[model samples]
Target: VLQVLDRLKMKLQEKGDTSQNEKLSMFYETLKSPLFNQILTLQQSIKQLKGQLNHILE
Candidate 1:
């Protein structure tokens, strides 16, 4: 999922740089904005949850 996000990020960057489409650029900006940070935060939360679950099982 992280890799997929990274790949999508890269593709967005490429499109954002080269494309003149306003709508596409806006969508790219939206993704590159706090949304990306949100995704990272969610990923971290998932990791912490996994650790807690494993410890509980042990």
Candidate 2:
């Protein structure tokens, strides 16, 4: 999860702007987007369920 943030930070850094304030704004704006939260939670759910599935697989 944090690695995702780190990847995002680095991804933004590589983009031309290099402004902390603007990058922060972009991050906040992304957080505000509904699809982003859905994407995050959906990903988390899928990963955790795999653990339960593993019990059965075992």
Candidate 3:
């Protein structure tokens, strides 16, 4: 996923385009809302719990 985003940014840079930044900004604008931090913290906990579950199951 990181590689895909990197490729997209590189392609946009090659074309001298700022549109990609604008697009990303719009996406990020959602995170500026009050609830996003709580959502992020929840996801982090989920990620940690899932990793431990995978370790135990495997």
Candidate number achieving the greatest TM-score relative to the actual structure:
2
- Each model's number of backbone clashes? 0, 0, 0
Per-prediction TM-score to the true structure, in the order listed: 0.42, 0.57, 0.45
RMSD of 1: 7.1
Q: All candidates' lDDT scores?
A: 0.71, 0.76, 0.76
Question: Between prediction 1 and prediction 2, which has the larger TM-score?
Answer: 2
**Relative to the unseen true structure, what is the C-alpha lDDT of residue 51 in candidate 1, on a scale of 0 to 100?**
97
Lowest summed lDDT over 10 consecutive residues: which window, candidate 2?
A: 16-25
Decoy 3 TM-score against native: 0.45
Of 1 and 3, the candidate ranking higher by lDDT: 3
- The TM-score measured for candidate 2 stands at 0.57
By lDDT rank, best first, the candidates go 2, 3, 1
Candidate 3, which segments miss by more than 4 Å at Cα?
1-28
Output the lDDT of residue 17, model 1. 57
Error of 2 at 43 (Å): 0.9
Q: Write the per-residue lDDT of candidate 2 for residues 1-58, one digit (tens) a residue.
A: 4456657667777896456746665776788689999999999999999988998896
